[PDB]
Design a protein around this ligand. Structure first.
Ligand SMILES: [Hg+2]
Ligand SMILES: [Hg+2]
Ligand SMILES: [Hg+2]
Length: 439
């Protein structure tokens, strides 16, 4: 096969992507060992769905798991009557999701389960795949001539040839695994044929963070979770929290081998100690550095020039309401809260008006990082930790370190009931989720 493994792509045909996927336990070879995972389409990751604005998607999900499941069309601004976080597909049953891809949309999105209390074990076991919305912007020479790859960043732990079970500690911290994989492969080699790479990045991990840095190179950020930036932004490193996506250009500077690494990062995970009296909780400290892939540059690389511009960000109407959402933790109970409450699917927490803009102030009063995700309604991050964001782009997950406040500009789009929650998925399963109704 190609030296760099990527999920198989399924493309829309004549404006229609019609596909049947089964969620099924699947024996496969992964990282040199045999394991049974839970997969879509018999693969890990699931197939990449590649569509264009205005395409029709018709996806029938058959549930061959022993428990209920569903899909969340993560990042897509579509109706929560389709992207329905309350829908349960029982074992053996099927459900067809049908929607039209919005006209003003581009980027890397993804699909995975969202059923309260069951997300963490299902996602950890392999139920995830990417969804790419192609853009006319993709035809500009500076992108068209780049070598494009998808990197699905997802870790795993195996026990007895199956995904390792969640421990009590995993429910508190979010589960991380020792196998730190890219597209299900262990430290693959990417032998570049072109000097400019266009990498679409997806953190599909339950809880692991990826503090991305390419040896000897900067990265040029060109898209966030849900759309292009206005122009490329040069960065020395790029943190991807669980659920986040990004697209970068890499301009290879000389021949040789360069490591793409996940550098040490302390997200506030905790261990337990006993040193005289307490059987007390203690910081795990930063993650160990990981090599994600080996990038081999071609001979005499001469990168394309960067595009001068990408996509102008919409000028939003003035906001009509400000919200405050405070995140807190009870670590020893593995319970997590928004404004002092745990999720209740019967309880509406916020009621907003379609087509108005709201300001959401999300404050992390816990001691761990908490990435905050809102379904259905992409947002513009204005600032985090009191620092203004250095670009304008659509996001749907925003990371908050302990004590930080994020201020978000949230246009409400589709009407209906949807959810917002922590995307360390164990924390969502353990209560850190609320309900928004848009009318
Ligand atoms: Hg998600
Ligand atoms: Hg969700
Ligand atoms: Hg969290």
């Amino acid at each position: 096969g190609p030296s760099f493994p990527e999920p198989k792509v399924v493309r829309s045909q004549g404006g229609l992507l019609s596909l049947k996927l089964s969620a099924t336990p699947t024996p496969l070879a992964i990282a040199g060992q045999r394991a049974t995972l839970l997969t879509y389409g018999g693969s890990f990751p699931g197939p990449t769905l590649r569509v264009r604005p205005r395409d029709t998607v018709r996806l029938t999900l058959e549930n061959r798991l022993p428990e209920p499941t569903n899909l969340h069309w993560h990042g897509l601004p579509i109706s929560p009557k389709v992207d329905d976080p309350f829908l349960e597909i029982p074992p053996g049953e099927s459900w067809t999701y049908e929607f039209t891809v919005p006209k003003e949309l581009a980027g890397t999105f993804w699909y995975h389960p969202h059923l309260h209390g069951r997300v963490a074990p299902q996602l950890f076991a392999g139920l995830l795949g990417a969804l790419v919305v192609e853009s006319s912007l993709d035809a500009i020479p500076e992108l068209r001539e780049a070598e494009e790859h998808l990197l699905v960043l997802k870790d795993l732990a195996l026990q007895g040839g199956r995904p390792a079970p969640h421990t009590p500690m995993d429910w508190m911290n979010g589960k991380e695994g020792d196998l730190v994989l890219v597209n299900g492969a262990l430290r693959p080699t990417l032998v570049a044929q072109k000097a400019t790479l266009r990498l679409r990045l997806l953190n599909a991990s339950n809880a692991r963070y990826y503090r991305l840095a390419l040896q000897d190179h900067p990265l040029y950020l060109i898209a966030a979770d849900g759309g292009f930036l206005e122009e490329p932004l040069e960065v020395s490193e790029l943190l991807l929290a669980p659920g986040e996506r990004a697209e970068v250009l890499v301009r290879l500077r000389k021949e040789g081998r360069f490591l793409l690494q996940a550098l040490p990062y302390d997200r506030g995970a905790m261990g337990m100690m006993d040193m005289g009296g307490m059987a007390h909780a203690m910081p795990q400290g930063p993650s160990r550095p990981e090599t994600l892939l080996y990038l081999i540059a071609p001979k005499n690389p001469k990168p394309l020039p960067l595009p001068k511009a990408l996509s102008p960000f919409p000028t939003l109407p003035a906001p009509v309401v400000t919200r405050r959402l405070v995140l807190t933790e009870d670590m020893m109970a593995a319970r997590f809260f928004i404004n002092g409450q745990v999720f209740d699917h019967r309880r509406v927490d916020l009621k907003g008006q379609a087509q108005t803009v709201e300001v959401w102030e999300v404050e992390n009063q816990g001691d761990m990082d908490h990435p905050f995700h809102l379904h259905v309604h992409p947002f513009q991050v204005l600032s985090v930790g009191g620092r203004p964001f250095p670009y304008r782009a659509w996001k749907d997950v925003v990371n908050l370190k302990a004590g930080e406040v994020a201020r978000l500009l949230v246009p409400l789009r589709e009407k209906g009931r949807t959810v917002f929650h922590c995307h360390i998925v164990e924390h969502e399963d353990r209560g850190m989720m609320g309900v928004l109704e848009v009318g």
